[PDB]
């Protein structure tokens, strides 16, 4: 029995990075030979495993995390890299084992005039733990007591939009990215093939 790789890669509507979408994949005969036929795969790299030797190994539990980010920020989705989206709304451990897959999707996410539907967290109190998600949209702290969802000396608001348009350079075009996380220790294997 096969498992939904055609649902996490061909999902109907991807999520924004500050509210990424986890999914579990177990109890199937996993086939990694369908991914290559998807896209030219602007980013396809694996930590702890090779992509060609993927179709013969067995794993314990496989998570799949999908979201959408900018072009020049794909480099931040890697262990131990400090940035702004790898700091405030998606962090993965320094002991990572898995793969990341990112492909350009300016075809489907860029509206003419600006797509103000993909937002990301810009302000937080402290950096967040690996694989942690927060959705609260509380107003951020300022030097003095913030205003009230309005302008002022500082009194800022946390989230910021993206503004994708079809003419933006490749560095500012929207990219869809999905991350697979495996486990290998003392495995009474549940998913492989």
């Amino acid at each position, epitope marked *: 029995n096969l498992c939904p790789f055609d649902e996490v890669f061909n999902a*109907t*509507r*991807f999520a924004s990075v500050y509210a990424w979408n986890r999914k579990r994949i177990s109890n199937c005969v996993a086939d990694y030979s369908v991914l290559y036929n998807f896209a030219p795969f602007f980013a396809f790299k694996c930590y702890g495993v090779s992509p060609t030797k993927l179709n013969d190994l067995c794993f314990t539990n496989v998570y799949a995390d999908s979201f959408v980010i900018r072009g020049n920020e794909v480099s931040q989705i890697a262990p131990g890299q400090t940035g702004n989206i790898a700091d405030y709304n998606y962090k993965l451990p320094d002991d990572f084992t898995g793969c990341v897959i990112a492909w350009n999707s*300016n*075809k*489907l*996410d*860029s*509206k*003419v*005039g600006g797509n103000y*539907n993909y937002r990301y967290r810009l302000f937080r109190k402290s950096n967040l733990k690996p694989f942690e998600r927060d959705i609260s949209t509380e107003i951020y702290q300022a030097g003095n007591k913030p205003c009230n969802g309005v302008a002022g000396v500082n009194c800022y608001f946390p989230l910021q939009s993206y503004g994708f348009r*079809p*003419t933006y350079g490749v560095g500012h075009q929207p990219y869809r990215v999905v991350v697979l996380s495996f486990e290998l220790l003392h495995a009474p294997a549940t998913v492989c093939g």
Partner: antibody
């Protein structure tokens, strides 16, 4: 991919115009897909009315805003346009058009309807 | 500034190459993609060129597009007799926040 408009083609002034674009070959639940409306007077240049993306982003023509309302009935795969306070200058043909994906940038107005001549008189 | 202007007439002759101009401004034609449509008597228009240089599947090779600063051009090669129709510009204007179009050119072959 096919589109077809329908409604009442003749209406007196100070009444409201309603139009219904029924389509076939795509669904307004996928990413990319969107539907818009474009009118053209008899012997004049084209004019853009309104647009509605798949995530319900109702863009309007500013000068014609405060008069137009576009809405979708996805279950029936159809879009409805409504414009109040019609006038004799609004006699034109109204096309409903489709915006899907291309190969490196979104396509706009790739497919058109067949029009619906609308006369506003007495 | 907020409306594109085209010359009304082209007037080529078979087997020749002609160009059609479209002048805009810093805000609409110089910072967005420029489309180019084609409209025949008694029929809805039909796309010719999007993204200033790309052709939808089903358009012959002879149609070419060009954008340069705040100006746009369409180049038709191998002019033929089945092409005498209206040609329209199209661009999204950020200052007006709407799509704007041009007047149109006749292009009747001799």
């Amino acid at each position: 991919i096919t589109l077809k408009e329908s409604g009442l083609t003749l209406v007196r002034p100070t009444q409201t115009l309603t139009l219904t674009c029924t389509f076939s070959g795509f669904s307004l639940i996928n990413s990319g897909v969107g539907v818009g409306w474009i009118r053209q007077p008899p012997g004049k240049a084209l004019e853009w009315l309104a647009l509605i993306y798949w995530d319900d982003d109702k863009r309007y023509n500013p000068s014609l805003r405060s008069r137009l309302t576009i809405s979708k009935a996805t279950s029936k795969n159809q879009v409805v346009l409504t414009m109040t306070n019609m006038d004799p200058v609004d006699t034109a043909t109204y096309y409903c058009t489709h915006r899907g994906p291309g190969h490196n940038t979104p396509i706009y107005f790739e497919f058109w309807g067949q029009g619906a001549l609308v006369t506003v008189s007495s | 500034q907020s409306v594109l202007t085209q010359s009304p007439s082209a007037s080529g002759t078979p087997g020749q190459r002609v160009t059609i101009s479209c002048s805009g401004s810093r805000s609409n034609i110089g910072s967005n993609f420029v489309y180019w449509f084609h409209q025949l008597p008694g029929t809805a228009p039909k796309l010719l060129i999007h993204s200033n240089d790309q052709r939808p599947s089903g358009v012959p090779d002879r149609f070419s597009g060009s954008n340069s600063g705040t100006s746009a051009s369409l180049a038709i090669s191998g002019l033929r007799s089945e092409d005498e129709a209206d040609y329209y510009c199209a661009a999204w204007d950020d200052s007006l926040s709407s799509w704007v179009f041009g007047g149109g050119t006749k292009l009747t072959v001799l």
